[PDB]
Amino acid sequence: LSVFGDRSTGETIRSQNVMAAASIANIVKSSLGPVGLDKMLVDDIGDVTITNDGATILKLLEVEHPAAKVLCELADLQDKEVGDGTTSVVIIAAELLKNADELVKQKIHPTSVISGYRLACKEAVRYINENLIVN
Amino acid sequence: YQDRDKPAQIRFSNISAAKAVADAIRTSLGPKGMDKMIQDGKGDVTITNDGATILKQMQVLHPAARMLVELSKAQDIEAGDGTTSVVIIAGSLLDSCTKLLQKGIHPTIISESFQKALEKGIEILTDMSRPVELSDRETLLNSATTSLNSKVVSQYKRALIAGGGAPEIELALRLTEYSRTLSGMESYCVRAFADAMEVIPSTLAENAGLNPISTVTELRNRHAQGEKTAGINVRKGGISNILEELVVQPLLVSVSALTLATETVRSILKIDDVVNTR
Amino acid sequence: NIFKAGADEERAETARLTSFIGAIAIGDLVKSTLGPKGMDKILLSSGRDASLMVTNDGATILKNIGVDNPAAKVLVDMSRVQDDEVGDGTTSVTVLAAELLREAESLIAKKIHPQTIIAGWREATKAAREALLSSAVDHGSDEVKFRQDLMNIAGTTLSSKLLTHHKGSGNGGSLADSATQQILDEAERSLHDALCVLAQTVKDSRTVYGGGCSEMLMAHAVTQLANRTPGKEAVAMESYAKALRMLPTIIADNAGYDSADLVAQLRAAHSEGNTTAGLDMREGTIGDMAILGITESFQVKRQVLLSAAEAAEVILRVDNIIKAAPR
Amino acid sequence: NIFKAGADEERAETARLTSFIGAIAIGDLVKSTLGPKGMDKILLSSGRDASLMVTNDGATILKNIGVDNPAAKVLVDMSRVQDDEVGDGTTSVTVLAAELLREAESLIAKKIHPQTIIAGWREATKAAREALLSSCSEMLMAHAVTQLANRTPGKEAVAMESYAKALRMLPTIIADNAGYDSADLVAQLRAAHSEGNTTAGLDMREGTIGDMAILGITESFQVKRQVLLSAAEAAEVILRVDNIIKAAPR
Amino acid sequence: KDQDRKSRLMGLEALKSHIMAAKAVANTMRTSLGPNGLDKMMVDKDGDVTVTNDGATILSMMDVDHQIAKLMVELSKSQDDEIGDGTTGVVVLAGALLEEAEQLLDRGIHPIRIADGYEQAARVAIEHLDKKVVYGGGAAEISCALAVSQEADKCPTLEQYAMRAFADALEVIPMALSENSGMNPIQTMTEVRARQVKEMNPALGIDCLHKGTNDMKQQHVIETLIGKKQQISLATQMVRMILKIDDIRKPGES
Amino acid sequence: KRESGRKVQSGNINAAKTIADIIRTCLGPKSMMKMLLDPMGGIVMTNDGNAILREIQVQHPAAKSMIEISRTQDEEVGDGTTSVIILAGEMLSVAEHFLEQQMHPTVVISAYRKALDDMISTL
Numbered sequence A: 001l002s003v004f005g006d007r008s009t010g011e012t013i014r015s016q017n018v019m020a021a022a023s024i025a026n027i028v029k030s031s032l033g034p035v036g037l038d039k040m041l042v043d044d045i046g047d048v049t050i051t052n053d054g055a056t057i058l059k060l061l062e063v064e065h066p067a068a069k070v071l072c073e074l075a076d077l078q079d080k081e082v083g084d085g086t087t088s089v090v091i092i093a094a095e096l097l098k099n100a101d102e103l104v105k106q107k108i109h110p111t112s113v114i115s116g117y118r119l120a121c122k123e124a125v126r127y128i129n130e131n132l133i134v135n
Numbered sequence B: 001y002q003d004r005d006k007p008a009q010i011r012f013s014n015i016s017a018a019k020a021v022a023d024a025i026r027t028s029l030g031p032k033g034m035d036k037m038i039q040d041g042k043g044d045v046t047i048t049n050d051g052a053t054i055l056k057q058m059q060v061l062h063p064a065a066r067m068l069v070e071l072s073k074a075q076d077i078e079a080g081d082g083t084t085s086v087v088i089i090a091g092s093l094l095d096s097c098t099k100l101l102q103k104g105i106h107p108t109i110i111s112e113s114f115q116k117a118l119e120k121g122i123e124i125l126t127d128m129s130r131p132v133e134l135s136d137r138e139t140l141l142n143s144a145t146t147s148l149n150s151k152v153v154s155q156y157k158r159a160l161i162a163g164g165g166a167p168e169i170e171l172a173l174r175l176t177e178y179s180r181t182l183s184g185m186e187s188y189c190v191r192a193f194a195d196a197m198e199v200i201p202s203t204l205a206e207n208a209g210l211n212p213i214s215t216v217t218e219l220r221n222r223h224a225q226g227e228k229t230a231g232i233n234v235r236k237g238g239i240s241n242i243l244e245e246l247v248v249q250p251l252l253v254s255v256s257a258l259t260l261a262t263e264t265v266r267s268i269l270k271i272d273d274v275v276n277t278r
Numbered sequence C: 001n002i003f004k005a006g007a008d009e010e011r012a013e014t015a016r017l018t019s020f021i022g023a024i025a026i027g028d029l030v031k032s033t034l035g036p037k038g039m040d041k042i043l044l045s046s047g048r049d050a051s052l053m054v055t056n057d058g059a060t061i062l063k064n065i066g067v068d069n070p071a072a073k074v075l076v077d078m079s080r081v082q083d084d085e086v087g088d089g090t091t092s093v094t095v096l097a098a099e100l101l102r103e104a105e106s107l108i109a110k111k112i113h114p115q116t117i118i119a120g121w122r123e124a125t126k127a128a129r130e131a132l133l134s135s136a137v138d139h140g141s142d143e144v145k146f147r148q149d150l151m152n153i154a155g156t157t158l159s160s161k162l163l164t165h166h167k168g169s170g171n172g173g174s175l176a177d178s179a180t181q182q183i184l185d186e187a188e189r190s191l192h193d194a195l196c197v198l199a200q201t202v203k204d205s206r207t208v209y210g211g212g213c214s215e216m217l218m219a220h221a222v223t224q225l226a227n228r229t230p231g232k233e234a235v236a237m238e239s240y241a242k243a244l245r246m247l248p249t250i251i252a253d254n255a256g257y258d259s260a261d262l263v264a265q266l267r268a269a270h271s272e273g274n275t276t277a278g279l280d281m282r283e284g285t286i287g288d289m290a291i292l293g294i295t296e297s298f299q300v301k302r303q304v305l306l307s308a309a310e311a312a313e314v315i316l317r318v319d320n321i322i323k324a325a326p327r
Numbered sequence D: 001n002i003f004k005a006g007a008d009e010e011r012a013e014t015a016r017l018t019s020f021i022g023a024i025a026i027g028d029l030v031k032s033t034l035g036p037k038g039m040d041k042i043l044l045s046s047g048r049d050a051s052l053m054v055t056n057d058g059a060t061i062l063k064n065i066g067v068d069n070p071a072a073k074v075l076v077d078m079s080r081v082q083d084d085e086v087g088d089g090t091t092s093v094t095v096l097a098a099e100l101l102r103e104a105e106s107l108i109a110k111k112i113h114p115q116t117i118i119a120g121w122r123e124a125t126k127a128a129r130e131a132l133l134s135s136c137s138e139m140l141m142a143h144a145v146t147q148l149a150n151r152t153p154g155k156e157a158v159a160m161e162s163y164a165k166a167l168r169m170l171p172t173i174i175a176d177n178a179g180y181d182s183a184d185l186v187a188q189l190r191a192a193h194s195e196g197n198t199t200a201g202l203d204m205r206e207g208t209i210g211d212m213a214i215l216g217i218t219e220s221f222q223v224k225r226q227v228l229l230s231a232a233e234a235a236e237v238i239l240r241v242d243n244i245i246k247a248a249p250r
Numbered sequence E: 001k002d003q004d005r006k007s008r009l010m011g012l013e014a015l016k017s018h019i020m021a022a023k024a025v026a027n028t029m030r031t032s033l034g035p036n037g038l039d040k041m042m043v044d045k046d047g048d049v050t051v052t053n054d055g056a057t058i059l060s061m062m063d064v065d066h067q068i069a070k071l072m073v074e075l076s077k078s079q080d081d082e083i084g085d086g087t088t089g090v091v092v093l094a095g096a097l098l099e100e101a102e103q104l105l106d107r108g109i110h111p112i113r114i115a116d117g118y119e120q121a122a123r124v125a126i127e128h129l130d131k132k133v134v135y136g137g138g139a140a141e142i143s144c145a146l147a148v149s150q151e152a153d154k155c156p157t158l159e160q161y162a163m164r165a166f167a168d169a170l171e172v173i174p175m176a177l178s179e180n181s182g183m184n185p186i187q188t189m190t191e192v193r194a195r196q197v198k199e200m201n202p203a204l205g206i207d208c209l210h211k212g213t214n215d216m217k218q219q220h221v222i223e224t225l226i227g228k229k230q231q232i233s234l235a236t237q238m239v240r241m242i243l244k245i246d247d248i249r250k251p252g253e254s
Numbered sequence F: 001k002r003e004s005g006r007k008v009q010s011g012n013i014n015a016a017k018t019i020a021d022i023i024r025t026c027l028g029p030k031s032m033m034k035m036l037l038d039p040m041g042g043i044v045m046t047n048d049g050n051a052i053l054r055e056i057q058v059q060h061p062a063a064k065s066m067i068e069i070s071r072t073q074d075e076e077v078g079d080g081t082t083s084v085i086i087l088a089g090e091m092l093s094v095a096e097h098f099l100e101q102q103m104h105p106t107v108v109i110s111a112y113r114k115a116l117d118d119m120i121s122t123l
């Protein structure tokens, strides 16, 4: 087919988006928790913003990739809604993709994976609510 | 044979470009259709599964492939539904034509044969449909409400037919029986028309996590024994009686799809070559 | 420094090839459109995308395509004359002329001079023209029969057109109700083409059977003339007959039927009486053209025979193309 | 590893080319020698310089020359049968059979089956023999076959013409070797025999057409009958083959 | 030892490669089927030259070094002692079943499942046949294809696609006789099949010798019932034996 | 583009160590001189640790941090700046315990912060 652009299909597109989200997670993986390690942020001019906060990193992290930008838009949803847990979100979502990508290699369709993750989140919220402690 | 002059290369050039547009838009069929990523030239990126929006944002340059794009617009104006199913049907018929042309069958014989399957096809769908009363505002409410539940907003031809690709299986099943009574090249040309319809439910079964073969293979027996009520139910994730699930579509969508798709396949088949003017 | 800086000259060896390759290409371009089962064709001007269109009209294809070869421009201009003047036979003229040059290139390969070829084609065109004159059928009385012939001739002209689905000097809604202007424009063109030959049919009530009957009947008289003729003229006239027989061969090939079976059967038919057999595109076999109701005007087939022979005669007389330095 | 260690197998179009070229090559080898004005030819063996010689007999040319392809051996073996059994017409068999295969190669390119061609040649051989009994001879047989082409089904008509066209090439090659305009002499014989005059032929002495009955030139009936049959039969074998199976050399 | 240069290929790429070899042996013999079959020019190792169309003699001289093709020859060695006549019909039918199987591998069917489908259809065909005896000329193959096609609808499992493929593969024998006779194969195929339903229920064959018409019963062309039963049985058994092979390992010389 | 893993810490060490090796001999009253090739072919024979690093171009951001921290020293204290970079480079030059022993930096940093409280008390 002749077009004014470019196209690319297949399972490798899932892998390319998986390795991208996995890369963004590793940028904020070692900085998880109160003993997290600091990380440099070399801007375009030359300034170097050193910090360990995962939320501050993702606001300044600039990776020109669509899958990474989805997690950046995802960060704003968690920051505004609650204001914490953004680092665990990007790390949890990255492992679900790296594990789901392995299932896709075992001839497991993503629709069956999407259905499993939805039911797991429902039951997880149930088990969480059943094992709380009130204020 | 020598086959010095090779005008068939333009048929395979138009079929490949036509089949390419269908292969891309195939996965986005149904509620469980896999989304697709479109990136504008400026830098913006978007995600969607509506087949109509994807074809517009493809920038199709080939003439034969543009006929499928304009074909999808005709379905939107006439019926307004089944936009993605039309392009998938045309891509499979042309892919089936690639097997017939290798056997030494002419495009005109293939074109005239497909019209006979279309003529018998409309009779098959119209016979197994469910007539309704238009003045009865009860049927129109639940018909659009249940259909709108399949659309984005779920909270806020006087006939009907089942979904889940069941019209394509009854069409493919009885056309194979109709081809046994025919004579000449129309037999293989109509059988190939029947096998092409099976791409739709196998695509729905694939998107629903089921096996594409065993799903349509099981339904072809349920249609030989039962009726068109048997179709793929993605809400439950398996084969079920679609008449009970209240997942139906009007008759004009399935009829206009075969009508407009076959006319495009007949038009593409009649292309012997293209001339560049100035 | 004989011809440089734009100015070129093709010698006798190359100009003999360029003259035929240019003309034969235009014939093979639009031969697929011949017959009621003609193949469509896309036209897309370079540099612009809005010029897309699809058609199976041999006349419309030649009008829009540009031509740089002078040998091809002669054959194209001679075809546009048939479309503007007669309104029918634009495709048969281009195909019949090209098939003659295709066979002529095989004759010159046998060291047959072009002038020796032209002598045979002039004698064959007389015998071929005499065949239509004898087999032509006029209708002075029985206006019902003459009215029926106009209906058959109208269907032949309208064949392979947009409208194919549905007494003196010859100076909204679907098509059946006679949607946009493109439908009405092509409706006027093919319909005007029918009025041209139909008006010519009133001025000349003679009619001949189409579907390969007239083309095969003329080809038979040429083969008979090949029995009483000098040596080299026989081999040249034999190629004139084969060019006429290639017309129904193309009408059958475009329809998907076995052309070698149908066309060779018509030879055995016409060779032993039976000057009515032709191609039945409906069923895909041979049948009497009179019973099936297929017939064409005599002046149309006459001009198609003469314009095709006169066109090919000009190419053979050419042996060296001269191109000066373009400005 | 489908074929190795000497053994080999030729495909359809490969064995097609190998079957016709091997037979047609032997044809054009002896085409120049056909006729009283036959062109000489040199034969020079390997390792024996003293074996240099010159001749124009087609039988002497084929007996000494080696044959590698198997299809050519079938045509060369049948030529030796004509030299031993009959004793004359050896070059006519080899030239006529190759012209039949030269035309059959063209018909196969036109999507014509070999078996359909053999059905026409068998019918054509009947009308040709009937023309000899009623009766230069090469054009009489071709005239009857051309008339038979107008009294036959569709595809068989085209095969009959190639059979007549092959017979017409014999006086063409006889005239070409003599230096005369073969296109005029042969086309004049065709125009003659088509309307009476079933005694016309070539006059190599004067270089024109003359009455064979008056000039006193004639050939035996049994010789021409075997030349027609041995050529069509030999060409039938090659045309019927579609695959060649080569075994390992010992 | 000699692990270097060892053959290593498996999956669909291996099965399709095996199917590619069997098709070459079938297509080579598909033209030599019937009385109008095209002969084969065989050159012996000793330099001899022979020409014939015997299916058995073609396979004996055909020294194909591919292993999958050798099994096709070993099959025909036994057929000469059981059937005798249709040695080309076995190889031509096996190549047809493997060619149609290639369309199923793309759909995602397992080779062992196709093997079970053909074994089920082969029993339906064998059951229907009793209903230089049965009527030859391809009448039996066309009648069996209709029965297998109808019974395929009564197979609710993935073998349904394989049963349909057995019907189309059965038609290659009559489709080959029409091609070798110089006629349109598909037009002659479907016309005879429609006559077996629309015109009349009894089976009718193909007129390959260009005699009066079809209905070989009038032409007195009849084959043995044991012949046809073993023909499609040996063909199916060879297809199952080839479908159940997905690795040809041979150590190379280092 | 970017750096990740053990390559970063070992890379920052070589950068800070390299900046200290320049001015190792610029300490004391018998300090050694340095030759700075200007882009125009000129030379400056200064022996001031602040002036040397000010004129040198550095690509690693770790070197920019070492130099920028030295400039902050000059504003507060115009002496001992050369000792800061040498000690910071020597404290980082012990890469045996850092990577070859596979100790985490938090283990090293806890020891360096414990010694600093002891170094302050001893002085």
Ligand SMILES: Nc1ncnc2c1ncn2[C@@H]1O[C@H](COP(=O)(O)OP(=O)(O)O)[C@@H](O)[C@H]1O
Pocket: F026, F027, F028, F029, F049, F078, F079, F080, F081, F082, F083
């Ligand atoms: N006369 C001296 N004898 C021994 N050591 C000295 C002497 N003068 C300076 N030093 C040492 O040199 C170091 C650097 O001194 P100074 O040049 O004043 O600071 P900076 O090198 O940062 O400019 C001091 O730590 C001091 O111990």
